[PDB]
Design a protein around this nucleic acid. Structure first.
Ligand SMILES: [Mg+2]
Ligand SMILES: [Mg+2]
Ligand SMILES: [Mg+2]
Ligand SMILES: [Mg+2]
Ligand SMILES: [Mg+2]
Ligand SMILES: [Mg+2]
Ligand code: NA
Length: 326
DNA sequence: CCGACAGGCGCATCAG
DNA sequence: CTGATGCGCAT
DNA sequence: GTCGG
């Protein structure tokens, strides 16, 4: 809430640039700026003060001065009053509808939940499920519910094979009091970077979670990434729990630490860390950290035995998961 | 200035 | 069909 | 939209 007006303004501009303008680097620029400002431990008194922060430049500083003086931004007032911009922005809130499809839909006269719900024939699988659970997917998940979900996933995984290790990542691993969805990092010894010695390792877990009615729908499903929907069991005469988004990522066992770093985030933290790695001459993904050659082609994976090792390579002091949040 | 901006999975689409 | 591209998504 | 060389 310190500088919350400013960070809200910048987040709104980010979403506009992503959803309406389709300018992913401007979106990221506004998000980077929002993040550094959120971290800044002083009440910002001018745009020039803000501009000293990395990621805040001339145009954001001028917007900040406007906001400080008036309590609003004309650019955003205008955006808020434009039906077409608002409609496109709205439709992107449905899982599976991004900026491109949102624009195409609004151009075809589809601009409301009502319009989506009578035009389901125009929606792909992912989008149909996103619409079905539109309200539920907007709701956050209390940590208490995350803990019940974790208990279910870890116990069902164990029933399939005691050699699986499932780790709940994302905001949950960062200590958050509520989470947007559940993210599960999965490993099994027969899946490494050197061999897949058993097939269907992810499939058997997904199937077991479906069998016990925890997983209720599938948005997408490959050999290493599952994206879908789950729901806690509720008791007699109690309202149902909201359906929840779940992501499962099966990662090579020997690459657990790059995997857990990726899947713990936050998203902005990973972008900042990965960008820092590049400046240091390395590239990081969910599998490995590799050095960069002169043309920017990656070399051989470096040895990693801990999350901290990755930080060490790029000369960052270790940040515990709880300090990787926005 | 100005090229770079994080990385990649699953899925759809198009050219051939 | 394969291969290249882009979308929408994950952190 | 912002930054590092
Ligand atoms: Mg600055
Ligand atoms: Mg969407
Ligand atoms: Mg999450
Ligand atoms: Mg997720
Ligand atoms: Mg599928
Ligand atoms: Mg997220
Ligand atoms: Na790799």
């Amino acid at each position: 809430t310190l500088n919350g007006g400013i960070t809200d303004m910048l987040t709104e501009l980010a979403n506009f640039e992503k959803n309406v303008s389709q300018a992913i680097h401007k979106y990221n620029a506004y998000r980077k700026a929002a993040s550094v400002i959120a971290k800044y431990p002083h009440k910002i008194k001018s745009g020039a003060e803000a501009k000293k922060l990395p990621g805040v430049g001339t145009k954001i500083a001028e917007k900040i001065d406007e906001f400080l003086a008036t309590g609003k931004l004309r650019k955003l007032e205008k955006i808020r009053q434009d039906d077409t911009s608002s409609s496109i922005n709205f439709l992107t809130r449905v899982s599976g509808i991004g900026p491109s499809a949102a624009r195409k839909f609004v151009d075809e006269g589809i601009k409301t939940l009502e319009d989506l719900r009578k035009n389901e024939d125009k929606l792909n699988h992912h989008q149909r499920i996103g619409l079905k659970y539109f309200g539920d997917f907007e709701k956050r998940i209390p940590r208490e519910e995350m803990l019940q979900m974790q208990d279910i996933v870890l116990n069902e995984v164990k029933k399939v094979d005691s050699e699986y290790i499932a780790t709940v990542c994302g905001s949950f691993r960062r200590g958050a009091e509520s989470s947007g969805d559940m993210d599960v990092l999965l490993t099994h010894p027969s899946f490494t970077s050197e061999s897949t010695k058993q097939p269907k390792l992810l499939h058997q877990v997904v199937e077991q979670l479906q069998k016990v009615h925890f997983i209720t729908d599938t948005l997408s499903k490959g050999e290493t990434k599952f994206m879908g929907v789950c729901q806690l069991p509720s008791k007699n005469d109690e309202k149902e729990y909201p359906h929840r988004r779940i992501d499962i990522r099966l990662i090579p066992k020997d690459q657990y630490y790059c995997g857990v770093l990726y899947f713990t985030g936050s998203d902005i933290f990973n972008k900042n860390m990965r960008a820092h790695a590049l400046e240091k001459g390395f590239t990081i993904n969910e599998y490995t950290i590799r050095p960069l050659g002169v043309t920017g082609v990656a070399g051989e994976p470096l040895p990693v035995d801990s999350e901290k090792d990755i930080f060490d390579y790029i000369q960052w002091k270790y940040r515990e998961p709880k300090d990787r949040s926005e």
